[PDB]
Amino acid sequence: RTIVVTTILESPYVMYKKNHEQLEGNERYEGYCVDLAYEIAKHVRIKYKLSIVGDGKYGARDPETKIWNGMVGELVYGRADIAVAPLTITLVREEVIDFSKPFMSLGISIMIKKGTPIESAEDLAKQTEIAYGTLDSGSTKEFFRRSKIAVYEKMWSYMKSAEPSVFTKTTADGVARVRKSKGKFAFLLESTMNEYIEQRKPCDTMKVGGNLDSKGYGVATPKGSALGNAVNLAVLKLNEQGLLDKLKNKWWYDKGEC
Amino acid sequence: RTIVVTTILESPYVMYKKNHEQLEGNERYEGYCVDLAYEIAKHVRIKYKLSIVGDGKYGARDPETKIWNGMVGELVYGRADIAVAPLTITLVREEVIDFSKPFMSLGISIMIKKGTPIESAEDLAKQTEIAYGTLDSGSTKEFFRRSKIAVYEKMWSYMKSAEPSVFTKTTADGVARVRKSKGKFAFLLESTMNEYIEQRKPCDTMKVGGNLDSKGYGVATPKGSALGNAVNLAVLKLNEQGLLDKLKNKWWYDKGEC
Ligand SMILES: N[C@@H](CCC(=O)O)C(=O)O
Ligand SMILES: N[C@@H](CCC(=O)O)C(=O)O
Ligand SMILES: [Zn+2]
Ligand SMILES: [Zn+2]
Ligand SMILES: [Zn+2]
């Protein structure tokens, strides 16, 4: 009856509220996806428990074991009834889980420390002084691994062969690496996160160049889940009611700091 | 065996080739959706025949008869197996047909003749000298009809009762009206079409302001259609393989004229 909603602590989607340690259950969290979950749950008429994905990962199929990790894994292996998170709709994932229509559009973007002489993926690919990386177990890394576009193939080859790893285990780590690397690290991450971070103190990062691709986050459910339909309709309704836009404004721009 | 692909004559998605009268079948047409259908069909491994929707409409449900027209109707009533078209994914359509994940992201946008003193929906809403309208039988019109947001409600109220009609039967008609109206007509249409027209001579129109909303086109199939799955996976694959980006460039920007 209480459905398990897997999600990931990723600002501003799901964040601990400042006074959270005096709260329990869903009350502890706030953010775009918390609001989204609330709104979805309201329309799908379910009780739900927000559960932060144990491994902290979005989800990436180990090529050896074929095991899916992250929230995708939570869904695939029956541990969560629905993932409400900035979980990118991708082909390999759609093969194993269902996604609502996107509740957010985004693209892979480059985050640089302000003043970094990078304006594009091409700029990154044609040089080596500025290291770059992406989130592990995420759609962005897969994008590059799988890309047949020459420049991205080159970036992938660099990243894949980067030592130490230029793959981070959290977005926060990637952002931290950008911020601490005096311009010598650029982070490839989704424009949504990039933009949010760009608006948070210390305001020392920025998104550069256009998006490398265009995709969406969807609310994910186990393949064939009967929840999937209601959730999809809920997402479409929320988008059309302008709630998603309002939420985006509320969580990205309204509190903007830069 | 041959699946019927409904689509609509809407530049640059589907256009007659110059020598179309010499040609038969799919060869008659060219454009983004013609290329996309070709790629989708190749990847789904189906033979298909493009069939231009008779009523030249995207699809809306007549409140009286409850009859779906346009491409949505072609799918709903079993005359087409798939719609490959700039068909907006909407809640009401999703209730009657299936959509792939979006192959294009877009929003309602304002097309003005260059020089028109309008920079936003608010600018349009708060005034009457500049008439504005949208396509009939499309998601844009429904967006305004359905909107509970004051500005758009005001715009809807304006449009609903504007005389003569500010609603056009084709995008082309709306564009032509913008172009002919000396800046006294603005056209609310999807950013995609807006951006395309912006790139075409006489180069006298432009998209202004941000998009009013954010949504996507999906390749549509009849609810529960088996084809739906492969098509969705095809779209995801083509997206990730950069096809859609390439097609967008090919049909919008590469031949750009402005
Ligand atoms: N949204 C991504 C995670 C962030 C990224 O990979 O950039 C995913 O679902 O995997
Ligand atoms: N893409 C829209 C048509 C264009 C518009 O309504 O502005 C639809 O599917 O209805
Ligand atoms: Zn705590
Ligand atoms: Zn002709
Ligand atoms: Zn192909």
Side-chain angles (χ1 to χ4, degrees):
Chain A
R1 295 311 301 246
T2 296
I3 76 146
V4 172
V5 175
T6 184
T7 188
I8 186 163
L9 281 168
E10 187 76 281
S11 303
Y13 300 97
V14 181
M15 296 178 289
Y16 274 104
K17 288 178 183 172
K18 184 181 67 286
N19 311 133
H20 63 268
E21 212 65 301
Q22 191 48 283
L23 299 166
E24 76 176 18
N26 300 344
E27 324 271 29
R28 296 165 290 172
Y29 305 114
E30 69 181 355
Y32 180 99
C33 285
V34 176
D35 284 352
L36 180 51
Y38 174 73
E39 290 291 356
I40 292 173
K42 167 168 306 198
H43 291 266
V44 176
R45 296 176 174 181
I46 56 180
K47 289 180 298 294
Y48 64 102
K49 185 74 179 318
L50 294 180
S51 169
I52 303 311
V53 61
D55 62 15
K57 307 280 186 295
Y58 286 87
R61 181 179 180 274
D62 184 285
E64 260 203 29
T65 65
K66 260 73 163 190
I67 308 167
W68 282 90
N69 69 353
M71 294 182 279
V72 173
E74 289 308 298
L75 293 180
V76 166
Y77 304 111
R79 290 186 297 265
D81 313 325
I82 185 179
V84 177
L87 190 61
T88 300
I89 302 164
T90 68
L91 178 58
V92 289
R93 291 173 173 172
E94 188 84 80
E95 294 172 339
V96 300
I97 57 170
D98 281 349
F99 284 96
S100 69
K101 293 302 187 292
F103 60 83
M104 192 167 296
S105 318
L106 56 303
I108 295 171
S109 58
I110 301 167
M111 167 185 292
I112 54 167
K113 191 157 194 308
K114 285 180 179 176
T116 303
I118 294 298
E119 302 187 4
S120 69
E122 286 80 35
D123 286 7
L124 281 177
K126 69 176 183 169
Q127 62 76 60
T128 64
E129 196 164 30
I130 301 170
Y132 49 95
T134 177
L135 185 68
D136 250 339
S137 271
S139 56
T140 296
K141 183 182 173 183
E142 176 77 350
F143 167 85
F144 287 102
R145 164 184 291 110
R146 295 320 178 177
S147 186
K148 298 301 184 178
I149 297 179
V151 52
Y152 306 152
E153 292 183 322
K154 189 175 186 180
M155 286 167 72
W156 172 242
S157 165
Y158 161 87
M159 289 190 290
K160 178 190 54 180
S161 299
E163 172 73 13
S165 178
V166 300
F167 305 116
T168 59
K169 299 296 183 181
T170 65
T171 300
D173 287 342
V175 174
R177 187 161 172 180
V178 169
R179 285 173 165 157
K180 277 166 189 157
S181 290
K182 298 192 179 68
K184 300 309 175 184
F185 185 75
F187 195 52
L188 292 159
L189 81 174
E190 292 159 345
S191 48
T192 41
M193 279 81 156
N194 208 337
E195 289 158 3
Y196 171 81
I197 292 300
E198 193 163 58
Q199 299 263 320
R200 303 298 288 169
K201 297 195 275 197
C203 324
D204 58 344
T205 66
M206 65 177 292
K207 184 185 193 301
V208 284
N211 293 344
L212 286 58
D213 62 9
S214 292
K215 48 199 164 182
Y217 296 149
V219 175
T221 52
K223 201 163 177 45
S225 170
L227 223 43
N229 294 313
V231 165
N232 184 49
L233 297 180
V235 170
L236 294 181
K237 169 161 273 293
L238 295 185
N239 189 24
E240 285 173 17
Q241 293 185 319
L243 179 51
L244 298 183
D245 289 345
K246 172 161 298 82
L247 286 193
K248 180 73 150 50
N249 287 145
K250 170 183 173 192
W251 291 107
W252 270 253
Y253 304 114
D254 294 357
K255 307 157 153 87
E257 307 182 320
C258 308
Chain B
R1 295 320 304 244
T2 303
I3 77 152
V4 172
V5 175
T6 182
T7 191
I8 182 170
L9 283 165
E10 183 76 83
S11 302
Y13 300 98
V14 184
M15 303 173 284
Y16 293 93
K17 289 184 190 162
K18 199 145 60 274
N19 55 325
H20 68 92
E21 205 69 27
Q22 285 307 282
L23 305 173
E24 58 186 38
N26 300 346
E27 322 264 44
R28 281 169 296 174
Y29 309 107
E30 62 175 349
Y32 175 99
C33 283
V34 175
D35 288 349
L36 175 61
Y38 173 78
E39 286 289 339
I40 291 173
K42 179 184 294 218
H43 286 256
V44 167
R45 292 186 183 169
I46 49 176
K47 292 185 299 300
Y48 66 107
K49 295 281 192 193
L50 295 178
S51 168
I52 297 297
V53 62
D55 61 13
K57 294 183 198 293
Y58 286 86
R61 178 171 138 202
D62 183 316
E64 280 202 24
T65 74
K66 256 79 181 194
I67 294 289
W68 286 92
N69 59 29
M71 297 178 282
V72 174
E74 293 302 297
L75 296 173
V76 165
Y77 303 113
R79 289 186 294 277
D81 295 284
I82 182 168
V84 175
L87 186 62
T88 303
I89 295 165
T90 69
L91 171 55
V92 300
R93 286 166 176 180
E94 185 81 275
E95 292 174 342
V96 303
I97 57 177
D98 282 341
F99 282 100
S100 70
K101 298 301 192 289
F103 61 84
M104 195 167 296
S105 293
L106 62 303
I108 301 183
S109 63
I110 299 165
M111 165 184 298
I112 54 163
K113 194 167 176 311
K114 286 180 171 179
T116 299
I118 292 296
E119 308 175 14
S120 71
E122 290 79 32
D123 288 349
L124 280 174
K126 71 171 183 181
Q127 63 79 60
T128 57
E129 200 162 28
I130 301 158
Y132 51 89
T134 66
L135 180 67
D136 235 4
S137 281
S139 49
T140 297
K141 185 181 183 182
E142 173 83 351
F143 170 87
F144 288 96
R145 169 188 295 110
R146 294 308 173 197
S147 181
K148 306 303 183 183
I149 301 188
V151 51
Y152 307 143
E153 273 172 330
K154 182 167 196 180
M155 291 172 66
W156 177 238
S157 177
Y158 166 82
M159 287 184 294
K160 178 180 40 175
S161 293
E163 193 85 24
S165 183
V166 291
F167 302 117
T168 69
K169 45 178 53 176
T170 64
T171 299
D173 289 351
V175 168
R177 187 163 171 180
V178 168
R179 284 175 167 153
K180 279 172 191 158
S181 298
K182 306 188 171 67
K184 302 301 165 178
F185 185 74
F187 191 56
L188 294 153
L189 82 177
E190 297 166 330
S191 45
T192 47
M193 283 77 158
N194 207 342
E195 290 165 326
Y196 168 73
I197 297 296
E198 202 159 46
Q199 294 295 321
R200 301 306 274 173
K201 299 197 272 190
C203 308
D204 56 355
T205 67
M206 62 181 298
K207 200 207 328 154
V208 296
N211 292 347
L212 278 48
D213 63 357
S214 289
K215 47 207 177 175
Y217 297 148
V219 173
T221 52
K223 206 151 183 62
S225 159
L227 218 352
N229 192 211
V231 165
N232 182 51
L233 296 176
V235 169
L236 289 181
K237 174 169 257 299
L238 294 174
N239 192 211
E240 294 170 11
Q241 284 183 296
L243 191 261
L244 310 178
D245 289 345
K246 194 164 288 88
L247 291 186
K248 182 80 141 55
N249 288 161
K250 170 181 181 178
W251 291 105
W252 270 250
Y253 307 113
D254 296 353
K255 313 153 142 80
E257 298 177 333
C258 308

